[PDB]
Every structure is written in structure tokens, then in C-alpha cells.
Design an enzyme around this catalytic site. Structure first.
Site, PDB file in Angstrom:
ATOM      1  N   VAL A  87       6.153  -0.138   4.109  1.00  0.00           N
ATOM      2  CA  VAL A  87       5.433  -0.944   5.085  1.00  0.00           C
ATOM      3  C   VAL A  87       4.208  -1.554   4.417  1.00  0.00           C
ATOM      4  CG1 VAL A  87       6.234   0.166   7.158  1.00  0.00           C
ATOM      5  CG2 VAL A  87       4.384   1.181   5.880  1.00  0.00           C
ATOM      6  N   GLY A  88       4.112  -2.873   4.458  1.00  0.00           N
ATOM      7  CA  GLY A  88       3.121  -3.544   3.647  1.00  0.00           C
ATOM      8  C   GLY A  88       2.735  -4.920   4.126  1.00  0.00           C
ATOM      9  N   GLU A 180       6.802  -5.038  -4.540  1.00  0.00           N
ATOM     10  CA  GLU A 180       7.453  -3.748  -4.680  1.00  0.00           C
ATOM     11  C   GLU A 180       8.916  -3.589  -4.310  1.00  0.00           C
ATOM     12  OE1 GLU A 180       4.434  -4.055  -3.133  1.00  0.00           O
ATOM     13  OE2 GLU A 180       3.207  -3.353  -4.726  1.00  0.00           O
ATOM     14  N   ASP A 203      -1.220 -13.649   4.711  1.00  0.00           N
ATOM     15  CA  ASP A 203      -1.663 -14.968   4.257  1.00  0.00           C
ATOM     16  C   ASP A 203      -0.531 -15.975   4.292  1.00  0.00           C
ATOM     17  OD1 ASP A 203      -4.231 -13.876   3.578  1.00  0.00           O
ATOM     18  OD2 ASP A 203      -3.373 -13.186   1.671  1.00  0.00           O
TER      19      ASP A 203
END
Length: 235
Positions: A87-88, A180, A203
């Protein structure tokens, strides 16, 4: 082990994997119950606690594919972890994708050499476990979260010297840039375990002045956490 000081039994067989050890700490204190620390080595905080009665772990992975490769390998091989969800955050390169929205990585493109070195004859796609991907999508849609399923680009170079090339991928079904997912997917394939990576857009690389509000930033994060956690414990 070697990079994780945990004893056997300290790590659940299903883990959330943020990039930031402090994010893991935040998840542990606000979304898990009775979470306790299982690793401090190299400051890579990891916790095991309970979600809806289910034993669940969370730990940071640092940035880049070599870093997460080290931790996912040890989790899988030394602690018998079977379900891993990243989760990122990511930057959107597909112009139809806006800030705060959710991306689920059906596959991960990469400019890394980790896969290609092992498989020089092939374009060898790194993919999410389908059942995980499908559960996360269904759960996200019930919460009316704006979700996009596609590829992401797992890059080696945050400060890219060829950003236009990266941007061009956004017109071909590649949603967002991250660092990742390809590595995680590759290890999952090698060891026959189940991985999914998900991210909210922080972003919009196509529109820099698309801003976000912090409080909004914590609603979105809460939204993603529940998709993440419900997906993780579904059987």
C-alpha cells in the site's frame, strides 16, 4: 532474518507493506488492535496485530526494488508469509487519472534489470495475484472509491533523466509511476505466493497544480487501508 530480527511466530502470514516504516507505525496504531513491534533493524519498523479478529502484520520496505526484494524474500522464505499487499503512493502519468484516486496494479512495468537479467529471452510481465486484485476491486467499488485497474511503472530512478519517455507510457494503459511493485510481484511468482500492490495518486505528473488537502489526504488513506485490510483477510 539478517535484515529482520523477528523470532518465529512474531509475524502473521499476511502482511501490509508500505514503503515508509513510519507509515507502518501509523497503520499499526490506528487500524490494528493490540499491535506490537517485531523489528527495529535498520529502523525498518514492523508490527503484528489484529484486524477483525485476524492476525495481520505491517512493515516498511524502504524504497526501490532492491530494498523491497530483500524484505519480501525474508518474509516469504523465513517467516512463511503467503499474502503480501503493498500500500503506497504513486504519481499519475495517465492524464485521465487524478490526485487521490486509487490504482490497483494488474501488472507492473519496470526499467529495472532484476527480471530481465534472469530472463534475457523474454518480456516477462510481473502480475498481481488475480483473486486478490479482483477482491480489492470489488471492495473498492462497494465503497464508491474512484478506482483504476491497470499497469504501473516500477522505476529505478525517481529523478529520471528521461521523463518524457515515462510520460509516453501513460497513453498506453500505464497508470502511475512507483518504485516497488515489479519486485514484489517477481518474488511472489518465484515463491508461489500471493501479492497485490495498490496506491493512491499523490501527484498528477500531467498537472502539477492539482493539489491536495491533508485532511483529504487522511480520508483517502483511510479508504485505501480498508480496501487493503479487507482484501488481506479475505479467504
Amino acid at each position: 532474518s539478517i535484515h529482520i530480527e523477528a523470532k518465529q511466530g512474531e509475524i502473521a502470514d499476511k502482511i501490509l507493506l508500505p514503503g515508509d516504516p513510519l507509515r507502518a507505525k501509523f497503520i499499526a496504531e490506528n487500524f490494528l488492535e493490540d499491535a506490537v513491534c517485531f523489528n527495529t533493524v535498520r529502523n525498518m519498523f514492523g508490527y503484528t496485530g489484529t484486524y477483525k479478529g485476524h492476525r495481520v502484520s505491517v512493515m516498511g520496505t524502504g524504497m526501490g526494488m532492491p530494498s523491497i526484494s530483500i524484505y519480501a524474500r525474508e518474509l516469504i522464505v523465513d517467516y512463511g508469509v503467503k499474502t503480501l499487499i503493498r500500500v503506497g503512493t504513486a504519481g499519475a502519468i495517465n492524464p485521465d487519472i487524478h490526485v487521490r484516486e486509487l490504482v490497483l496494479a494488474q501488472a507492473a512495468a519496470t526499467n529495472s534489470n532484476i527480471i530481465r537479467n534472469d530472463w534475457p529471452e523474454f518480456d516477462f510481465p510481473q502480475i498481481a495475484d488475480f483473486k486478490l486484485l479482483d477482491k480489492a476491486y470489488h471492495i473498492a467499488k462497494e465503497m464508491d472509491i474512484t478506482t483504476h485497474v491497470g499497469s504501473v511503472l516500477s522505476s529505478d530512478v525517481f529523478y529520471s533523466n528521461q521523463p518524457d519517455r515515462n510520460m509516453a507510457l501513460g497513453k498506453l494503459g500505464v497508470h502511475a509511476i512507483e518504485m516497488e511493485a515489479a519486485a514484489l510481484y517477481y518474488l511472489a511468482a518465484q515463491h508461489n505466493v500471493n501479492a497485490l500492490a495498490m496506491m493512491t495518486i499523490s501527484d498528477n505528473l500531467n498537472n502539477p497544480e492539482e493539489d491536495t488537502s491533508a485532511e483529504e489526504r487522511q480520508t483517502t488513506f483511510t479508504d485505501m487501508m480498508k480496501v487493503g485490510l479487507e482484501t488481506l483477510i479475505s479467504e
